[PDB]
Paper text:
Human mitochondrial nuclease EXOG (hEXOG) is important for mtDNA integrity. hEXOG depletion selectively increases lesions in mtDNA, but has no effect on chromosomal DNA. Human EXOG shares sequence homology with members of ββα-Me nuclease family, which contains nonspecific endonucleases. The catalytic Core domain of hEXOG is identical to EndoG, but its C-terminal extension forms a unique Wing domain that converts the enzyme from a nonspecific endonuclease into a DNA-geometry-specific exonuclease. Conversely, in mitochondrial LP-BER, the nuclease reaction occurs before DNA synthesis: hEXOG processes the 5′-end of DNA downstream of the lesion, generating an optimal substrate for DNA synthesis catalysed by Pol γ.
Apo hEXOG is a symmetrical homodimer. Each monomer contains a Core domain that is extremely similar to that of EndoG (r.m.s.d.=0.8 Å), and a helical-bundle Wing domain that corresponds to the C-terminal extension. The N terminus of each hEXOG monomer undergoes a domain-swap where the folding of the region is identical to that in EndoG, but the involved residues are from the opposing monomer rather than from the same monomer in EndoG: the residues 58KAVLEQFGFPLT70 (hydrophobic residues are bold) of one monomer collapse on a hydrophobic patch (277GLVFFPHL284) of the opposing monomer 30 Å away. The swapped domains represent 45% of the total dimer interface in hEXOG, and thus contribute substantially to dimer stability. A Mg2+ is found in each active site, forming octahedron coordination with five water molecules and Nδ of N171. In contrast to the completely solvent exposed active site of EndoG, the active site of hEXOG is an enclosed V-shaped cleft. The cleft, measuring 32–35 Å in depth and 15 Å in width, is lined with positively charged residues from both Core and Wing domains, and is both electrostatically and dimensionally capable of accommodating dsDNA at its end. Interestingly, R138 and R314 bind two sulfate molecules in the apo structure in an essentially identical manner to the phosphdiester backbone of substrate DNA, reflecting their affinity for negative charges.
Author numbering:
A (entry chain B): 59 to 358
B (entry chain A): 60 to 358
Write the structure that this text describes.
């Protein structure tokens, strides 16, 4: 071993890298994370960290020769997709900024990012209403397709001068613990979604896969300390695996748009769109709406 | 601490060390990422016999991430050694470990028995001129540019376990003249397509900068090597000259002698060699006559 190692073994750069509220293993060949692990709680998703102040940038800890850069993404047709989302880190502006390091980012379909994937992210945060602790591992996959001659082929686009790999699919593994002293079994689910637009017809359980199947697809072992001889419940049986429906999600998005409205006309438009979609505003929308109206009336 | 309560995901990329090679395994592709070996005059000599070895799953790899012979047999692809059997004549154990599928990628049959074998033979030849030679070999899946300018990585996966077929193979060669020599080290990096390659392209046509290969592979090779110091191009201080058609064909024909089971087959080896317009050398005729006497002395 000494003779072989005389000038060192090759370095793969796969070591776990830690940040304020997430950790990841980076793929230096694909210029994306292999996996990103985070922990979510009630208190971490509250706070005044503001995603509007964050900017994407290369992770300063990655050797530049293996980093992606914003030039790889901008104008590629793909969005910069967070694996650990900014919204899980309202409690810390530093933790949020670190999710904008490109080590946390994959090329993601714009509609998937702002649609189905966002709804899954929101469900992960919703779980903290019912579980004290939630762990999530997120990452990309490049899965095979069978072509006309029966051969199975893995095909993926690489974008930019740095050849950043565009995944065919994205995965989440969700682990939830009711409390730190409860004897209730842990709840786990694994999900794989295609990196494309997905509407409201498929329920999250349609994308659920067995943990063992995802490990075989990804070449990873998730939560290895987790005792798999003990009883672990399917998260979609003990919990809901119910994403926000069109009305709830549209109301959510419309409420968010209030805070960026720069004129009274934009506000009324937001209201009229909601009314034309036959969605009634809830008390929270009306609170934010009326406060924004008064704010805009008091500004130049 | 909470984040890590149930462990980080395992990627399984730790270096795995064997008798005369080491590797880092890719559990998703079911192939090595890199295989490092050391070659010397003495290691390529000995009585270890490749014909006794069997391909098998590496007993150290979790079965869920291992390839199996069933993935390769009948796939259209050969089981290609990264660390070759022929570098381990000194040790039957070392050779057998190169037949663990953790050392194996799906390799084009003609590439395996042709251009890649010629590169393997050149690496062994270097031990005549350098006391120590290190080699890192591995697979690559590189992109091709489509008609619209889109760059696409496409590779086949074979068998029930979806073993990844590389588009290209790489070798990094590092050579040191002696343990007491002052001259700089010799290094070369090479990338060849995983397809039939004839005798026209010289090895230097497939040479790449170390930096370029590292960018393509996501690897850093020989990290203790001080690249500040002057490291010479292996193809400048040595020849990077592969065996030509006549030399290689003679080599292959000489090998087929030892497996001849009849004077009939033994004469057809001679015929094929001559009909290739190659004349036997003294060594060929030596082994040929030894085998002729042997076969006449057997049932
Ligand atoms: Mg997103
Ligand atoms: Mg071979």
């Amino acid at each position: 071993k000494a003779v072989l190692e005389q000038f060192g073994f090759p370095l793969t750069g796969t070591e776990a890298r830690c940040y304020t509220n997430h950790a990841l293993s980076y793929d230096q060949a694909k210029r994306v994370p292999r996996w990103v692990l985070e922990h979510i709680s009630k208190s971490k998703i509250m706070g005044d960290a503001d995603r509007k102040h964050c900017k994407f940038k290369p992770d300063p800890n990655i050797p530049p020769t293996f980093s992606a850069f914003n030039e790889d993404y901008v104008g590629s047709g793909w969005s910069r997709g967070h694996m650990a989302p900014a919204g899980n880190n309202k409690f810390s502006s530093k933790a949020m900024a670190e999710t904008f390091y490109l080590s946390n980012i994959v090329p993601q379909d714009f509609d998937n990012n702002s649609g189905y994937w966002n709804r899954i992210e929101m469900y992960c945060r919703e779980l903290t209403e019912r579980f004290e602790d939630v762990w999530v591992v997120s990452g990309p996959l490049t899965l095979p397709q069978t072509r006309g001659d029966g051969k199975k082929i893995v095909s993926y686009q690489v974008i930019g001068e740095d050849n950043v790999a565009v995944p065919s699919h994205l995965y989440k593994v969700i682990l939830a613990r009711r409390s730190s002293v409860s004897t209730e079994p842990l709840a786990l689910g694994a999900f794989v979604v295609p990196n494309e637009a997905i509407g409201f017809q498929p329920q999250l359980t349609e994308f659920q896969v067995s943990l063992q199947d995802l490990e075989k697809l990804s070449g990873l072992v998730f939560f290895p300390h987790l005792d798999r001889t003990s009883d672990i419940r399917n998260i979609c049986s003990v919990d809901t695996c119910k994403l926000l429906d069109f009305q709830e999600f549209t109301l959510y998005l419309s409420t968010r748009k209030i805070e960026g409205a720069r004129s009274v006309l934009r506000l009324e438009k937001i209201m009229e769109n909601l009314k034309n979609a036959e969605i009634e505003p809830d008390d929270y929308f009306m609170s934010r709406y009326e406060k924004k109206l008064e704010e805009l009336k008091a500004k130049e």
